[PDB]
Design a binder for this molecule. Sequence first.
Ligand SMILES: [Cu+2]
Ligand SMILES: [Cu+2]
Ligand SMILES: [Zn+2]
Ligand SMILES: [Zn+2]
Lengths: 150, 150
Amino acid sequence: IKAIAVLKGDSPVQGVITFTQEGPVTVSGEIKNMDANAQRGFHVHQFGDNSNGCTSAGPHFNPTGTNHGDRTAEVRHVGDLGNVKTDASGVAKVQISDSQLSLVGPHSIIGRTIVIHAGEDDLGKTDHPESLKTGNAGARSACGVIGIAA
Amino acid sequence: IKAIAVLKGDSPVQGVITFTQEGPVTVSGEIKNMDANAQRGFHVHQFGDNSNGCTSAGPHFNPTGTNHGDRTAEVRHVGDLGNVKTDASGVAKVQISDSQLSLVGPHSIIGRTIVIHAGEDDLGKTDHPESLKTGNAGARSACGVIGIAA
Ligand SMILES: [Cu+2]
Ligand SMILES: [Cu+2]
Ligand SMILES: [Zn+2]
Ligand SMILES: [Zn+2]
């Protein structure tokens, strides 16, 4: 099973992310025009609504009704993919295998939005009021609706 | 249940289409910058893949494995929404109630693509080799991935 998203937003950041699944989902692709040598929050948001740009994507995809965390944490939203790393050229070469994402069933991310943020995800580990909501990762630099691919 | 798509392409045509369902799906919205006083083919295509613009959307969404027809015809693809009409200003005010579309289940269009074409859909009623495939409606002026909305 395959899905894909084309990310764009109110910023120069752009990329293409693929999702494949036989089991874990493999997330891959390149996101460009980001800050160099950085860590940036990467999350599946609930709605595939791009009518108000990335803002209409809503909160993190959270079908289990829990709080925000790192991708590897015990407590995390299904949509929490942690921070991705950019190189000196501002490119994030995304490569993630995640067992909470799915492309089928009740936890499917098809028709939702993948978002790359302007800041680092704080992993739900601060006293900031957005920490347990979103990781306080700042603006949504780019996003794309997750669609079924061939 | 609600879904939404933002349509853009390699043309000036742009719009926002909503889909609502309790039963039939109601399709509504405005598509702008089209030719004036025209009829233009409007279809759900199989893939929500915008990585090669509208071209990567693939063929008409066709889970029942049949041939192309008008929205009201006996023989039609599930994705066949016929022609929409534009006014003198090049605006299509889309308003359709369709019983073959769905936002849930095996025939769900979530994560697929809605496409507006540059030409009239021939309704599967000509000898053109694309008639039974697509209605020979010409270029894909704009398209959008269909996402879950609030
Ligand atoms: Cu986010
Ligand atoms: Cu078409
Ligand atoms: Zn989260
Ligand atoms: Zn068709």
